[PDB]
């Protein structure tokens, strides 16, 4: 039934309504609920420096209603890790590679929490990246994500020492994209595919190569 839609520069003309809706939900969730005050904006849209022409959005849609999602950004451009949190990756270094994309802004609307959507969103990042030939995703995440990643079978590689970020323990890591990880998740969600790709085909790795 309901799917996760891959939205990028090549097909966003089919999703302008949905994209604006997701920016407002991000404000509701990350600003009003999670109190990430540095992200508050007077337009009520949660938009940062990594929302541009090269961003890819993976949004869970029920009809045209956004119920969850996350985003991917090429590490060949200045990234949140390289610009905002490079000290979190001081041991191994910040990623910079067309085959590594930065993963952020994971959310589920209140109406869909503690249900089937969460594991579908985990499957979605693996499915999209495997299809595109992306090898790893990078993340700056709160340490409570570690057991969640492990529960979903995600292979995680820490890049530096955990540190407090605005009162919350946070760490930089890569996640390995794995066919085997995805296969298990497909079985668990009971669907052979969770990512829908409408409109023109996106060549993500090619685009990321152009960026650097
Ligand atoms: N573009 C940005 N610039 C500066 N800080 C940001 C940011 N995006 C998120 N943050 C901060 O990072 C912390 C959350 S943890 C890091 C980012 C988070 N995993 C995400 O998905 O976005 C919060 O304190 C938040 O205010």
3-class secondary structure per residue, 151-177: HCCCEEEECCCCEEECCEEEEEEEEEC
Q: What was the experiment behind these coordinates? A: X-ray
Closest-CA residue, ligand 1 atom 1, reads 48
Q: Pick the closest to residue 139 from 49, 78, 79 (CA basis).
A: 79
User: What's the gap in Å between 166 CA and the centre of ligand 1?
Assistant: 10
Q: Phi first, then psi: what are they for 50, rounded to 5°?
A: -105, 10
With contact defined as beta carbons under 8 Å apart, do 70 and 107 qualify? yes
Beta strand extents in 37-167 (DSSP E only): 56-62, 65-74, 100-108, 136-142, 155-158, 163-165
Cβ atoms within 10 Å of 43's Cβ, excluding its own: 9
User: What's the gap in Å between 114 CA and the centre of ligand 1?
Assistant: 23
Strand partners, 66: 61
Q: Is there an atom of ligand 1 within 6 Å of 5 CB?
A: no
Q: Pick the closest to residue 43 from 68, 26, 60, 64 (CA basis).
A: 26
Pocket test for ligand 1, best of 23, 39, 175 (most atoms within 8 A of CB): 39
With contact defined as beta carbons under 8 Å apart, do 45 and 27 qualify? yes
Distance CA(21)–CA(125), nearest Å, equals 21
Strand partners, 138: 102, 174
Scan for tokens 């009003």, then name that residue: 32
Distance CA(135)–CA(83), nearest Å, equals 22
User: What's the gap in Å between 77 CA and the centre of ligand 1?
Assistant: 17
Give the pair of three-digit tokens for residue 160. 């530096």
| Experimental structure resolution, Å | 2.0
Strand partners, 25: none
In degrees, rounded to 5, the angle at the alpha carbon of residue 9 between the alpha carbons of residues 45 and 178 is 95
Tell me the helices (H) and strands (E) count for the chain, helix number first.
6, 9
Q: Which residues contact 186 (CB under 8 A, 6 or more apart)?
A: 123, 192, 193, 194
Q: Which residues contact 120 (CB under 8 A, 6 or more apart)?
A: 4, 60, 189, 191, 194
């Amino acid at each position: 039934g309901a799917m996760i839609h891959a939205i990028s520069a090549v097909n966003r003309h089919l999703y302008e309504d949905v994209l604006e809706q997701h920016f407002r939900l991000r404000h509701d969730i990350f600003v009003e609920e999670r109190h990430w005050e540095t992200l508050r904006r007077p337009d009520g849209r949660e938009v940062d420096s990594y929302d541009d022409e090269d961003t890819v959005y993976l949004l869970a849609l029920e009809g045209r209603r956004v119920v969850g999602g996350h985003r991917l950004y090429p590490t060949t451009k200045p990234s949140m890790m390289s610009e905002v949190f490079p000290h979190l990756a001081a041991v191994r270094g910040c990623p910079s590679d067309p085959l590594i994309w930065e993963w952020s802004r994971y959310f589920v609307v209140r109406d869909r929490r503690d249900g089937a959507l969460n594991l579908q969103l985990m499957a979605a990042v693996q499915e999209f990246c495997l299809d595109q030939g992306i090898a790893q995703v990078s993340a700056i995440m709160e340490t409570w994500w570690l057991p969640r990643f492990h529960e979903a079978g995600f292979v995680v590689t820490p890049l530096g020492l955990p540190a407090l970020v605005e009162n919350a323990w946070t760490m930089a890591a890569t996640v390995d994209i794995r066919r085997q990880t995805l296969d298990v998740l497909h079985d668990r969600i009971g669907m052979p595919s969770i990512v829908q790709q409408d409109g023109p085909r996106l060549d993500a790795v090619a685009r990321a190569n152009l960026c650097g």
